[PDB]
Write a structure and sequence with these properties.
Distance between the termini of chain A: 64 Å
Organism (chains A, B): Escherichia coli (strain K12)
Radius of gyration of chain A: 28 Å
Subcellular location (chains A, B): Cell inner membrane
Protein name (chains A, B): Lipophilic envelope-spanning tunnel protein B
Order of helices and strands of chain A: EEEEHEHEHEEEEEEEEEEEEHEE
Family (chains A, B): Belongs to the PqiB family.
Strand order of the largest sheet of chain A: 11-12-8-9-10-7-13
Oligomer: part of a larger assembly
Structural class of chain A: mainly beta
Subunit structure (chains A, B): Homohexamer. May interact with LetA in the inner membrane. May also interact with partners in the outer membrane.
């Protein structure tokens, strides 16, 4: 479409190496038509599964301390060169269209694989080429942004790399941008100042390939494997996605999502517990809201407790098991509990033996 | 008017490609008169709907890590080149004036379409070329700033791109700049340090094409579709534009705007509720102000509640429905409520069944 590369005479690069030549371009109102020369001993090195991308001029990277000027053929200093490479799923890009298309960047040429669609309410955080990362490892890429004024949403069409398209895009998959959070409590992400991405949490179900972009998503997958109990509450309060679930002050679980009931009288809370602490949850385990700072008072004297709480940052649900000489069976995968509106007075003196 | 491009001999660019030549300029006290050569096989590539823009010298971009020097004809290294392109609505720019005008930048040449006018009280945040963005997608552009000392206001004349001029500019449309907000509560926008823009919320009505620039505007359009009830209060308090409206602690609506009554005894609050939670609002639904931190005290002992509230950030109006064995009908599009001055004591024990 628009490349400042060359009129004629730049070099065809392959894995950043100079073999080939661009011999003819012609401008058009929409898109160039570009003719390349490669050597006859050399035509085996490209096949159907090959993508082409172009760059122009001296690209001085700023990465860390280095400022690397392009050790370039003087062709590229005057007229920007074109690179190419073979890859796995480049056949589907050639099945559409009459011939190959010369992409404007390296990462735009890598965008092959299964193509999903995100329905975001706001594209203020999105960009073309913004990576989709699972556990910090890049699995996908946004390749376009479209505004629809009829349905008030931005449809971002993304691709997933061919290894991950079967494992993801299964429905119940959460997509969310990660924004830098700089507060008085502390900085959470600071790379996302300069390079934002999309965190993704997989799901299990039918291959929908039609998604919406959420607000928050659990970062670590260490709580993905264990049971997913549902906890009923009269109100939400300070509960949110990512709020820790605690046993005796240690973090054993997190709140995955929050929604109302099927009849709107209670807010049910979806939380997951780790595999190591999966056995702590019993059929009789009272839950209560340990949120924020609770300080006491008396008529003859008062004492307070302040503990720089993560509960003050995100109000954590705590639990314990009442003592019984027969132990109740383990809680099932889907089990409904209700909160105690106050902390039980005697759970510090319970000491209920939960083995293994 | 003022371009450092060339005396004679730079190249005419088309989609960043070198076909053509600038053969004659003459200086004048106001504006240059520039004569261009293009090839006779090539004159089909430009028509009436064509805009011209010029740039001068090596433009090293700083975007991210890259510092791309212009892979340029050595003409441009000495004498800056001129580019052009065809587009949709360039006819109206040629209907005015005797001939085409050579713009000083690429984005200034793209400023075509319907021309609105903003009446801002302060141009400290505005600039020429500042984009107007709906849902983060660019729809418009400011092209000039004028100070009037008679009417104490700055008239900024903006353009809207021809796809969006019919959907916007309909009256009841909110324009607002978005400024970076860096506080102890957290950072809200940080791109707008370096690149500010104007958020826009559309409206429905007559094509006014005469606007004023507001202070705050709802960012997301996820609350644009549902009903818009009006809620009456004795005072404003901590209520503002963007304050969430909550059902059982989950956010179901936002306050759109605030104004006084037709006779000044009460402040009425315009709020919109989502489509999913539209059915929760009934004809008997008490509203109360859940703003900030309310802690209790007693003669024999006191207990406090602190919950890192967004209500402390923006004081959210909460609601619930009293129980009745017949359910009242749904609230209409325009319905007037009044706040309860205190929280009802028994809404936690209500549990009013609201189906679907």
């Amino acid at each position: 479409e628009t490349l400042p590369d060359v009129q004629a005479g730049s070099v065809v690069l392959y894995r950043k190496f100079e073999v080939g030549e661009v011999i003819t371009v012609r401008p058009r109102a929409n898109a160039f038509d570009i003719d390349l020369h490669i050597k006859p001993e050399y035509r085996n090195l490209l096949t159907s599964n090959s993508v082409f991308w172009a760059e122009g001029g001296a690209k001085v990277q700023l990465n860390g301390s280095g400022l690397t000027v392009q050790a370039s053929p003087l062709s590229r200093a005057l007229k920007g060169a074109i690179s190419f490479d073979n890859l796995s799923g480049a056949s589907a890009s050639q099945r559409k269209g009459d011939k190959r298309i010369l992409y404007a960047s390296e990462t735009a040429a890598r965008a092959v694989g299964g193509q999903i669609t995100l329905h975001a309410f706001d594209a203020g955080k999105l960009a073309v080429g913004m990576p989709i990362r699972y556990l910090g490892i890049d699995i996908g890429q946004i390749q376009t942004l479209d505004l629809i004024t009829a349905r008030n949403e931005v449809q971002a069409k993304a691709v997933l790399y061919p290894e991950y398209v079967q494992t993801f895009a299964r429905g119940g998959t959460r997509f969310s941008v990660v924004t830098p959070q700089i507060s008085a409590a502390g900085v959470e992400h600071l790379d996302t100042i300069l390079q934002p991405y999309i965190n993704v949490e997989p799901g299990r179900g039918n291959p929908r390939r039609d998604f919406e972009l959420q607000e928050a998503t659990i970062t670590d997958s260490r709580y993905l494997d264990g049971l997913s109990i549902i906890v009923e509450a009269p109100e939400a309060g300070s509960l949110g996605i990512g709020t820790p679930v605690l046993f005796r002050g240690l973090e054993v679980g997190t709140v995955t999502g929050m929604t109302l009931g099927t009849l709107s009288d209670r807010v049910m809370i979806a939380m997951r517990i780790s595999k190591r602490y999966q056995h702590l949850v019993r059929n009789n385990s009272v839950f209560w809201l340990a949120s924020g700072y609770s300080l006491d008072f008396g008529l003859t004297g008062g004492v307070v407790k302040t503990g720089t709480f993560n509960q003050f940052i995100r109000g954590g649900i705590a639990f314990a098991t009442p003592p019984g000489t027969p132990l109740a069976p383990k809680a099932q995968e889907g089990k409904h509990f209700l909160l105690q509106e106050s902390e039980p007075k005697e759970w510090r003196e319970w000491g209920t033996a939960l083995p293994k």
